[PDB]
Amino acid sequence: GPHMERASLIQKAKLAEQAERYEDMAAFMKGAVEKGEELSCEERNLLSVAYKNVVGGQRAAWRVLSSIEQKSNGPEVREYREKVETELQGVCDTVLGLLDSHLIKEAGDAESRVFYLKMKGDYYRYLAEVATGDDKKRIIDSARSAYQEAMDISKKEMPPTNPIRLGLALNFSVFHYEIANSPEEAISLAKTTFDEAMADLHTLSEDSYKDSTLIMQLLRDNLTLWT
């Protein structure tokens, strides 16, 4: 039944991860989520790994094509870039559909809520990277809302060294800089996040310390690049 089917899909997603077949992994994880049970921390990570690898591959390809198209200014680049764009949009719409119909909930843990809301902001941000007109404006607003709701929860419920909180503040600052064209907000957010995490690092254990410091190095690299 549903419980047996779900267990199989999770095992298959773990096999697909080992085999580095991320589109398969994503499909198994989508099916597992559609069984209706809450995802465990391990399962959330399987879902995130699966789709981030799929969309990451598409985004990298789109950037290559978009760069050739921008430099060459025939029809082939535009047509092919459009095909890649459509595939990317479909993956983002799938993730967003899963988040809205199954994963985004009022209950329970602030960790899982911030996790899903950040994921919502991320996939709307990926859509914004390739969007153009009034659609782009709607997408930018949706990413901003998801990130802000996640920021409000993380500031109230998580310590400033928490990697979900750090990762969220990093992505939202990427959003401000790259998408919303607010470099000042991006720099300010990245500095604040880094400073607040820096003040608390001594309270961490060797395990937690390595997690937090990794994301702080990323914040710092982005500030070097943006200032």
Partner: peptide
């Protein structure tokens, strides 16, 4: 290229 949050 700018960094975004790494995989959990």
């Amino acid at each position: 290229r700018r960094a975004s949050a790494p995989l959990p």
